[PDB]
Amino acid sequence: MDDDGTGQKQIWRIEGSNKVPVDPATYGQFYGGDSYIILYNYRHGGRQGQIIYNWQGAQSTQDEVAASAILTAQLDEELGGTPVQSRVVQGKEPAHLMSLFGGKPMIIYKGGTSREGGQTAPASTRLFQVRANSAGATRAVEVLPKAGALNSNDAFVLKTPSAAYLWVGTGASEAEKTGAQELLRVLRAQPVQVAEGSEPDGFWEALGGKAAYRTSPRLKDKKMHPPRLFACEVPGELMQEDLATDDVMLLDTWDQVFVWVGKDSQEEEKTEALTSAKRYIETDNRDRRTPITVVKQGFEPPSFVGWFLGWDDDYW
Ligand SMILES: [Ca+2]
Numbered sequence: 001m002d003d004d005g006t007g008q009k010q011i012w013r014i015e016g017s018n019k020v021p022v023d024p025a026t027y028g029q030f031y032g033g034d035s036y037i038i039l040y041n042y043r044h045g046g047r048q049g050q051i052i053y054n055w056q057g058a059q060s061t062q063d064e065v066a067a068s069a070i071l072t073a074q075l076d077e078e079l080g081g082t083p084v085q086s087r088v089v090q091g092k093e094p095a096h097l098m099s100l101f102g103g104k105p106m107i108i109y110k111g112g113t114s115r116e117g118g119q120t121a122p123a124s125t126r127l128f129q130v131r132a133n134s135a136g137a138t139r140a141v142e143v144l145p146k147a148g149a150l151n152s153n154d155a156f157v158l159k160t161p162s163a164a165y166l167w168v169g170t171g172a173s174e175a176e177k178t179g180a181q182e183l184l185r186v187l188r189a190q191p192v193q194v195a196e197g198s199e200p201d202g203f204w205e206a207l208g209g210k211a212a213y214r215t216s217p218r219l220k221d222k223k224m225h226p227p228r229l230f231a232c233e234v235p236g237e238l239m240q241e242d243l244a245t246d247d248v249m250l251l252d253t254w255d256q257v258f259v260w261v262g263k264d265s266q267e268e269e270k271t272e273a274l275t276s277a278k279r280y281i282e283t284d285n286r287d288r289r290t291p292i293t294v295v296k297q298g299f300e301p302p303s304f305v306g307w308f309l310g311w312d313d314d315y316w
């Protein structure tokens with residue numbers, strides 16, 4: 001879609017059974033715990049059109065999803081059945097949707113709203129993982145504020161009641177550094193720039209203590225054979241939900257192939273997958289000493305988890 005993303009748009013958040021207008025000053029910022037509807041009006045190649053994007057946050061509940069279905073059908077009917085429809089889950093946004101916020105990164109907060117609990121309040125200390133894809137689309141995703149959440153391939157923003165830090169992983173790109181800066185703007189905080197490896201003591205303290213985190217030779221490399229996750233190939237950002245718990249998945253990071261074993265995958269799926277990995281590495285050229293590392297659901301090592309966009313240790 002060559003439309004440039006600058007058309008007029010309206011964004012609503014599913015709240016209970018209704019769609020509620022989102023504060024226009026915050027378009028581009030979303031709660032991962034919620035579902036949203038975006039009505040985008042555009043004019044391109046001399047013709048006017050509309051697109052309804054249904055965006056489902058990674059933690060949005062099934063009842064919100066069911067509510068959006070009703071809301072979107074109503075909107076569509078209201079509009080005379082003219083808009084183009086596109087359903088999108090967090091992390092799988094098309095380039096055109098990412099372009100709707102004038103170059104700003106899509107920011108995804110933890111929490112959200114619910115019938116039973118209403119709107120959650122922001123935590124006092126927060127950490128955001130900022131990652132951009134090859135095309136440059138950038139996402140700032142809030143995660144738990146612990147040292148273990150860091151990964152060398154991205155930029156991170158840590159905000160506390162008393163300080164802000166922009167941590168730059170060794171493999172982070174300028175797009176990630178720039179998105180981090182924009183996020184800091186939204187958070188109204190001035191950061192202390194920190195390069196991975198020369199963190200001041202105040203940074204580790206804010207995170208509750210220094211600890212090992214997600215790193216490896218590949219995660220540290222700025223360059224980037226981008227890692228591919230193959231189903232028992234998964235496009236978009238690598239999300240924890242892409243790991244089929246009843247199956248076995250392969251994550252190829254070039255100098256290493258991980259064999260991820262779902263808790264409910266049958267024994268034979270691991271066997272086949274291992275056989276396949278060996279062959280995959282020999283189909284090609286590379287090295288025959290390419291390690292094939294087996295990992296089990298819930299016991300993933302940091303060198304594996306680092307490739308994911310914002311992992312939740314309790315996800316399962
Ligand atoms: Ca919600």
Ligand SMILES: [Ca+2]
Binds near residue numbers: 131132155172
């Ligand atoms: Ca990165």
Ligand SMILES: [Ca+2]
Binds near residue numbers: 247
């Ligand atoms: Ca299976």
